[PDB]
Amino acid sequence: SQAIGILELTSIAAGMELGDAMLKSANVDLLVSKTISPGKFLLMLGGDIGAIQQAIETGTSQAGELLVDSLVLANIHPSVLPAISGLNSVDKRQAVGIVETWSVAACISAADRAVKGSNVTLVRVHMAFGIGGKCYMVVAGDVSDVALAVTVASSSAGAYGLLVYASLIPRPHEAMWRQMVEG
Amino acid sequence: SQAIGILELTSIAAGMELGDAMLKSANVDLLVSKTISPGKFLLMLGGDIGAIQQAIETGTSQAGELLVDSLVLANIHPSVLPAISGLNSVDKRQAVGIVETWSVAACISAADRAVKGSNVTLVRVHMAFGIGGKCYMVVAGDVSDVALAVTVASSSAGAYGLLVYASLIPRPHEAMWRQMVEG
Amino acid sequence: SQAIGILELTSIAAGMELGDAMLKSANVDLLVSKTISPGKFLLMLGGDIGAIQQAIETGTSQAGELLVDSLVLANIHPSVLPAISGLNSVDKRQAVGIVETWSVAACISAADRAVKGSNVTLVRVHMAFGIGGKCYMVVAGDVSDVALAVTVASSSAGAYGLLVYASLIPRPHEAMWRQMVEG
Amino acid sequence: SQAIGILELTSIAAGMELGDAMLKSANVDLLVSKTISPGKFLLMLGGDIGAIQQAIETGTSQAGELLVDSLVLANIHPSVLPAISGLNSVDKRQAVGIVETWSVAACISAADRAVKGSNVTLVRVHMAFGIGGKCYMVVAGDVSDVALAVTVASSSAGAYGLLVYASLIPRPHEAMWRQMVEG
Amino acid sequence: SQAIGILELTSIAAGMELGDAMLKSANVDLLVSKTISPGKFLLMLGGDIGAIQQAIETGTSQAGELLVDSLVLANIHPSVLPAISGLNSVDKRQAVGIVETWSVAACISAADRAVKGSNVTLVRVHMAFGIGGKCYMVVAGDVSDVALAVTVASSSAGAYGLLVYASLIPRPHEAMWRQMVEG
Amino acid sequence: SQAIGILELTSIAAGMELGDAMLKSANVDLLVSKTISPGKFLLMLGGDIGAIQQAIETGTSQAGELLVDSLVLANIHPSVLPAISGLNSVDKRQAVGIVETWSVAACISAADRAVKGSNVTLVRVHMAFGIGGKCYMVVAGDVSDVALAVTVASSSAGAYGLLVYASLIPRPHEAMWRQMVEG
Ligand SMILES: [Cl-]
Ligand SMILES: [Cl-]
Ligand SMILES: [Cl-]
Ligand SMILES: [Cl-]
Ligand SMILES: [Cl-]
Ligand SMILES: [Cl-]
Ligand SMILES: [Cl-]
């Protein structure tokens, strides 16, 4: 029902002007607004499909040659957006699943598939260094729910040859729990 | 507890003589004894560690330059062996997990970690074309049991960078079931 | 009225999951579901056009980078489907016609043109080694019916420069009959 | 007194048409009629010299450019023909000799020399993958008879630098016996 | 019973002198006597085998270094000769078959095979540009007779890998008939 | 039980000094002590394992950079040693077996396996030109004994890909016997 808008610019100045412009243009949520090395700027938006398409169109149009990349990931589960913008709350210490991918796009799709495919909590979708680099999604819940989530997410990523590794941590320890679930 | 002994020869004649020789030498069970393209012969032995080590040593010693490859996989779960030899019986139509790898060495280790870290039935360990090629292991049971099993085995293969793909088929079809479980 | 759906994957695991997925998705019939060397998997579906298109779209979409090839051969004669899946029964020992081609697609189109173009029995459509390799179709009946079938099928394959050879064997040796017709 | 006819074609269709043609042409026995990778077809015939020469001449003439190879192995011992077409019966579990060669031609000559040179039973002449690949002949009988057979056959093959390996299995075990003598 | 003699010279002067010389030498009939691009001369003779052999021998001997090519096509059906020299009369508008080949030799042998192999009328054997270029033969009669003719002729040409295309025109049109049959 | 010690030096002077030194060091017997082309010296010692190991260690230690090669072959049959040193006596004119190899190391191992796995007389182990060159072993006795012997020894050499050829001469000739058995 929802959507992810990705707009990567070759300029920070352009990114901020365009980012502001996109927020005013429709009812969109800015999930990410950061500089990536070696000078590129990243804008990540959440919201209803039409709003995202309108913002990304306004963005790309105004962007001109400053546009590095623009992507619209459609039909995303609601939980995915806050997992991109920050963290989703975990009710209790249970099993943890981590699926590592190449590209935020692949990670988002894996996360989405996991969310539909199970009763897990999608804790967060992390980007180590920009849109094409190592990304990981963290899921929490029953060992069985986490196993299903992990297999589903791995298969999603693996299908596009962008799966790095996926792990299941039943009964994680404190140090790790805080580090996996809270960042 | 058990062990898998792998011996690949550059000659069918050598393979049969060596195969027979290995069977007489210890209390090993011939699991696989076939020709692989483009002329190489494969021998796979099952049994206790010491017997397998003795058999593989006798094999490699007598093999000389005819030896292509020799491998000894120890601390192997019982169920694994007959899944290499042939098929393991499935009590009822439930979920099916398939983990695809590069190398039987890898597939065996995946299948092993599966069985230990689950209540699944390891149906079979298939080699499409020899020891280094595409291999797949088929597990059956609860969707949750298959899910754990599939993940574990995947992470096993993934760690050595030899996972191809892995899939979960809950509620498999009339025809696909016969193919996946019966060969 | 009928259609052929061809899906070739780079993974057996993906092939089985996708194959099962396609069977559930529409009222399609699995004609071929086999591994091809050196690790690629083949899916061939028969059924009504819309069902085949939906199935192949679902297949290709889910396949991602694991997709080797996908094809939808439309407006196929009913008899072609069982000739792909297995054999069609021959009423009586009469003349035999063989048309050899490069690609199962060529072969199917040749077989289809032969079936519409004559009163022959299309015995079988055989693939020696996968979708792009040597294929052959076997027809039986009157020497005249077989001649028409063979010329038609040759002129179909030849048009795309994929005709290998075509032969007419009026009254074959029973040994040859048992081979070409009876499989 | 007898002879082996070898006709290898670049087309399956041509192979079947020509194969049928050869069977009708003279009193010849079709010992082999199979497809070889990557699309070539193999015809192996047994019979009296004149019949074989006539069939191979008819074959090669009609073959034209579709001819890959044609060979006539003359003065072959009767037992060699059924050993090519299938298996020769072994009276009792005794010693087994295996001689491995490159090319069916070399294998046939070695088998023939072994048959004349001893009281062994030539069980079978096997081709792993076509006319030029790994071929092996299996002999059975007394350890002394099998030793003579093996030395003779090895010397034959070795003379043309086409011997791969040759082994003597006195007292083979069941698993192996069934696999060496029955295929 | 009849034969075709082909003599291609590197000189028109030589061709005419040699052409005349052969006509005097035996009871041969000049079928074709024309210049081919880019300066080569072509002579085609019809008659009894011995006469053709004598004429072609005399031709090649006297030709010396001016000889491009010489060929004697033996055991040719009488109807082929006038089909080379000109046209054969068609009794009634029926189906038309066209077999296109590379080389007049391949076309002649296809035409001959078609004539023996059926009750068709061989209308003409056409050469577009010299002995090695595109040639076609036109047959007329029953759709069944024409189909048999076309399959036979195609298999002939195809065997030597010189088949271009072959077509069957049942019920040809007012204008196309005149073109296909009358040149 | 016995051992063969091989020491090849880059100097004749070093070879003689080292040779003498090795004889004094243990209860080893000098089997071979000769110059090889193009200046290298060869020493072959016979005796009990420990003595041979001590001798070869003393040899290699004192040899320094003058060492070309050193080898210790253990579990050698008595008969082998004098067949290296010179000739073994043949009781009567019977069948003769000759097994030709690359390297004396290989020839010795072949000759060994022969003697253990037969009742043949190992007549001699000949080196045409040094340790790595053509070597042959001559066995005599029953055709059956020679046959077993020849095969065993061949399979030994073949396994290391160092068999050249092997022959069986039942009923050898007046002159050839003297050459084969007496040198
Ligand atoms: Cl910033
Ligand atoms: Cl949700
Ligand atoms: Cl177990
Ligand atoms: Cl139909
Ligand atoms: Cl076949
Ligand atoms: Cl016989
Ligand atoms: Cl001894």
Side-chain angles (χ1 to χ4, degrees), chain D residues 130-154:
Chain D
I131 78 147
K134 294 271 211 70
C135 302
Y136 65 83
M137 41 143 289
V138 179
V139 299
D142 294 9
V143 184
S144 51
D145 290 14
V146 166
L148 227 160
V150 180
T151 41
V152 168
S154 295

Coordinates of all heavy atoms in Angstrom, one line a residue, chain D residues 130-154:
Chain D
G130 N 30.7 -42.0 -26.4 CA 31.0 -41.9 -27.9 C 32.3 -42.7 -28.2 O 33.0 -43.2 -27.4
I131 N 32.6 -42.7 -29.6 CA 33.7 -43.4 -30.3 C 35.1 -43.1 -29.9 O 36.0 -44.0 -30.2 CB 33.4 -43.6 -31.8 CG1 33.8 -42.3 -32.6 CG2 32.1 -44.1 -32.1 CD1 34.3 -42.6 -34.1
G132 N 35.4 -41.9 -29.5 CA 36.7 -41.5 -29.1 C 37.1 -41.4 -27.7 O 38.2 -41.2 -27.3
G133 N 36.0 -41.5 -26.8 CA 36.2 -41.4 -25.4 C 36.6 -42.6 -24.6 O 37.0 -43.6 -25.3
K134 N 36.5 -42.6 -23.3 CA 36.9 -43.7 -22.4 C 35.9 -44.9 -22.7 O 34.7 -44.8 -22.6 CB 36.8 -43.4 -20.9 CG 37.8 -42.3 -20.4 CD 39.1 -43.0 -20.0 CE 39.8 -42.2 -18.9 NZ 39.0 -42.3 -17.6
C135 N 36.5 -46.1 -23.0 CA 35.9 -47.3 -23.2 C 36.5 -48.4 -22.3 O 37.7 -48.3 -22.1 CB 35.9 -47.7 -24.7 SG 35.2 -46.5 -25.8
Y136 N 35.8 -49.3 -21.9 CA 36.3 -50.4 -21.1 C 35.7 -51.7 -21.5 O 34.6 -51.8 -21.8 CB 36.3 -50.1 -19.6 CG 34.9 -50.0 -19.0 CD1 34.2 -51.2 -18.6 CD2 34.4 -48.8 -18.7 CE1 33.0 -51.1 -18.0 CE2 33.2 -48.7 -18.0 CZ 32.5 -49.9 -17.7 OH 31.3 -49.7 -17.0
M137 N 36.5 -52.8 -21.4 CA 36.1 -54.1 -21.6 C 36.3 -54.9 -20.3 O 37.2 -54.7 -19.6 CB 36.9 -54.7 -22.8 CG 38.3 -54.4 -22.7 SD 39.3 -55.8 -23.3 CE 39.2 -56.9 -21.9
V138 N 35.3 -55.7 -20.0 CA 35.3 -56.5 -18.8 C 35.4 -58.0 -19.1 O 34.5 -58.5 -19.9 CB 34.0 -56.3 -17.8 CG1 34.0 -57.2 -16.6 CG2 33.9 -54.8 -17.5
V139 N 36.3 -58.7 -18.6 CA 36.5 -60.2 -18.8 C 36.4 -60.9 -17.4 O 36.7 -60.3 -16.4 CB 37.8 -60.6 -19.5 CG1 37.9 -60.0 -20.9 CG2 39.1 -60.2 -18.7
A140 N 35.9 -62.1 -17.5 CA 35.7 -62.9 -16.3 C 36.3 -64.4 -16.5 O 36.4 -64.8 -17.6 CB 34.2 -63.0 -15.9
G141 N 36.7 -65.1 -15.4 CA 37.2 -66.4 -15.4 C 38.3 -66.7 -14.4 O 38.4 -65.9 -13.5
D142 N 39.1 -67.7 -14.6 CA 40.3 -68.1 -13.7 C 41.2 -66.8 -13.6 O 41.3 -66.0 -14.5 CB 41.3 -69.1 -14.4 CG 40.7 -70.5 -14.6 OD1 39.5 -70.7 -14.4 OD2 41.5 -71.4 -15.0
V143 N 41.9 -66.7 -12.5 CA 42.8 -65.6 -12.2 C 43.9 -65.7 -13.4 O 44.1 -64.6 -14.0 CB 43.4 -65.6 -10.8 CG1 44.3 -64.4 -10.6 CG2 42.3 -65.6 -9.8
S144 N 44.4 -66.9 -13.7 CA 45.4 -67.1 -14.7 C 44.8 -66.7 -16.1 O 45.5 -65.9 -16.8 CB 45.9 -68.5 -14.7 OG 44.8 -69.4 -14.7
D145 N 43.6 -67.2 -16.5 CA 43.0 -66.8 -17.7 C 42.8 -65.3 -17.8 O 43.1 -64.6 -18.8 CB 41.6 -67.5 -17.9 CG 41.7 -69.0 -18.1 OD1 42.8 -69.6 -17.9 OD2 40.6 -69.6 -18.4
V146 N 42.2 -64.7 -16.7 CA 42.0 -63.2 -16.7 C 43.3 -62.5 -16.8 O 43.4 -61.5 -17.5 CB 41.1 -62.8 -15.4 CG1 41.2 -61.3 -15.2 CG2 39.7 -63.3 -15.6
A147 N 44.4 -63.0 -16.1 CA 45.7 -62.3 -16.2 C 46.3 -62.3 -17.6 O 46.7 -61.2 -18.1 CB 46.7 -63.0 -15.3
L148 N 46.2 -63.4 -18.3 CA 46.6 -63.5 -19.7 C 45.8 -62.6 -20.5 O 46.3 -61.8 -21.3 CB 46.4 -65.0 -20.2 CG 47.5 -65.6 -21.0 CD1 47.4 -67.0 -21.0 CD2 47.6 -65.1 -22.4
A149 N 44.4 -62.6 -20.4 CA 43.5 -61.7 -21.1 C 43.9 -60.3 -20.9 O 44.1 -59.6 -21.9 CB 42.1 -61.9 -20.7
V150 N 44.1 -59.9 -19.7 CA 44.4 -58.5 -19.3 C 45.8 -58.0 -19.9 O 45.8 -57.0 -20.5 CB 44.3 -58.2 -17.8 CG1 44.6 -56.7 -17.5 CG2 42.8 -58.4 -17.4
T151 N 46.8 -58.9 -19.9 CA 48.1 -58.5 -20.4 C 48.1 -58.4 -21.9 O 48.6 -57.4 -22.5 CB 49.2 -59.5 -20.1 OG1 48.6 -60.8 -20.1 CG2 49.7 -59.3 -18.7
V152 N 47.3 -59.3 -22.6 CA 47.1 -59.3 -24.0 C 46.4 -58.0 -24.5 O 46.9 -57.3 -25.3 CB 46.4 -60.6 -24.5 CG1 45.9 -60.5 -25.9 CG2 47.3 -61.8 -24.3
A153 N 45.2 -57.8 -23.9 CA 44.4 -56.6 -24.1 C 45.2 -55.3 -23.9 O 45.1 -54.4 -24.7 CB 43.1 -56.7 -23.3
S154 N 46.0 -55.2 -22.8 CA 46.8 -54.0 -22.4 C 47.9 -53.8 -23.5 O 48.0 -52.6 -23.9 CB 47.5 -54.2 -21.1 OG 46.5 -54.3 -20.1

